[PDB]
């Protein structure tokens, strides 16, 4: 198995990580590379699919 590095997005890699979500507590979080800190709550907003 040989790995190549070229001028490309280079999206060839396995699992990043996974964890369980806890609500109603102040905590840091990282979703899809987006970092943040706060308290998570159930949201009644209806997002569009995209």
């Amino acid at each position: 198995l040989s790995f190549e590095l070229l001028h490309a997005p280079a999206t060839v890699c396995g699992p990043k990580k996974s964890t369980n979500l806890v609500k109603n507590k102040c905590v840091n979080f990282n979703f899809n590379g987006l970092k943040g800190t706060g308290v998570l709550t159930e949201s009644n907003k209806k997002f569009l699919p995209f």
């Binding site: 001028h7 490309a8 997005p9 999206t11 995209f50």
Partner: protein, 40 residues
Amino acid sequence: LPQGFSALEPLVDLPIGINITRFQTLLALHRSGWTAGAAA
């Protein structure tokens, strides 16, 4: 073109990384020689 307003839904994203400079459309032709219906 009709009036009114309507937003456009994003559909496809492709990481191709190539150069595009010129293009052409493609149609479908059927023989009954060949007949094509109205289209704009």
